[PDB]
Amino acid sequence: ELVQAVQHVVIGPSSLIVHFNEVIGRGHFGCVYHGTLLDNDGKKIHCAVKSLNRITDIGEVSQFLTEGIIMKDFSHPNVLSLLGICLRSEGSPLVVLPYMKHGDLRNFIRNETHNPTVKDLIGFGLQVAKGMKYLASKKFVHRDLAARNCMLDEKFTVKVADFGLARVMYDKEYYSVHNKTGAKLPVKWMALESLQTQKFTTKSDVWSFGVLLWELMTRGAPPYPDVNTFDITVYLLQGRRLLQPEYCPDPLYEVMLKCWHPKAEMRPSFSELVSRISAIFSTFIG
Numbered sequence: 596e597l598v599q600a601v602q603h604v605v606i607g608p609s610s611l612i613v614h615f616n617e618v619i620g621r622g623h624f625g626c627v628y629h630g631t632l633l634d635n636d637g638k639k640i641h642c643a644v645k646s647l648n649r650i651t652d653i654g655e656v657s658q659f660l661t662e663g664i665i666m667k668d669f670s671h672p673n674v675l676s677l678l679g680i681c682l683r684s685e686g687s688p689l690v691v692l693p694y695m696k697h698g699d700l701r702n703f704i705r706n707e708t709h710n711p712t713v714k715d716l717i718g719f720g721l722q723v724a725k726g727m728k729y730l731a732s733k734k735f736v737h738r739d740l741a742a743r744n745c746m747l748d749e750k751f752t753v754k755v756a757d758f759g760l761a762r763v764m765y766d767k768e769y770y771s772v773h774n775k776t777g778a779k780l781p782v783k784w785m786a787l788e789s790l791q792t793q794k795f796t797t798k799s800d801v802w803s804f805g806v807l808l809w810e811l812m813t814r815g816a817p818p819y820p821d822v823n824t825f826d827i828t829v830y831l832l833q834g835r836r837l838l839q840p841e842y843c844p845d846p847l848y849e850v851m852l853k854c855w856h857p858k859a860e861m862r863p864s865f866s867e868l869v870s871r872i873s874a875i876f877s878t879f880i881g
């Protein structure tokens with residue numbers, strides 16, 4: 596049943612050549628490698644192969660196939676596509692993604708050799724909002740939305756993605772898995788109710804999106820640098836937020852304040868964020 600359903604997601608050695616010698620990135624989930632996908636005509640597609648080195652038991656493997664079925668359906672220009680999954684008889688399972696020429700958004704904006712304007716940064720955030728509006732229409736909760744998980748392709752199109760631990764189905768398993776592997780929770784990106792109740796919704800993704808807008812307007816600065824991870828909840832309960840960046844227009848900072856509304860039901864939806872940020876974006880010349 597799950598096996599029959601996941602077949603269209605599986606790719607194998609008849610199409611994929613993983614270059615285990617060419618490492619793109621090292622993480623808590625395993626490594627990312629350069630890959631080559633040859634289609635039926637014979638043409639080459641450059642890709643990134645994420646290895647999920649911790650998935651071993653029946654319950655982990657079955658949750659992974661379920662996630663592949665969900666993520667294989669994704670088709671939106673601001674959402675990183677899933678090319679397929681490798682279910683090898685030997686070796687850890689692999690996730691095959693399209694290769695992103697300019698890396699992750701945080702690295703791109705933090706690099707001293709790159710000089711993006713304020714309009715470019717607002718535009719990058721507008722692309723993330725469009726990608727999240729699509730995810731939210733599928734009832735897909737990100738849980739880890741941050742500038743480090745937004746990729747930039749050869750055309751400077753932002754793709755919403757995740758380069759962390761394997762995705763789980765239940766919020767109870769999300770904390771359980773982070774504690775079992777020593778991977779830190781993305782505390783400074785979590786909504787107040789997520790920090791206190793351990794649950795995640797699309798409204799808590801809207802909170803993380805506000806932090807991502809703040810990362811873009813500061814060119815990759817760490818949020819709440821002087822606030823300890825364990826002091827974040829009291830800081831937020833006191834009504835304190837991230838301060839308005841130096842080159843951030845007043846209407847954009849108002850949008851961030853609405854994302855960080857203590858009442859989750861009062862935050863804007865991603866559809867409202869797309870409408871609001873397009874209006875702000877158009878007033879910027881260039």
Ligand SMILES: C[C@@H](c1cccc(-c2c[nH]cn2)c1)n1cc(-c2cccc3cn[nH]c23)c(=O)[nH]c1=O
Pocket residue numbers: 645659662663666669674675676677680690692736737738739755756757758760761762763
């Ligand atoms: C398609 C893409 C993607 C696009 C937009 C949002 C998200 C997201 C939000 N919150 C968690 N993920 C993921 N994607 C998919 C996988 C993936 C593929 C197949 C199976 C599993 C099991 N876990 N992850 C799997 C991956 O590793 N990385 C990645 O970038």
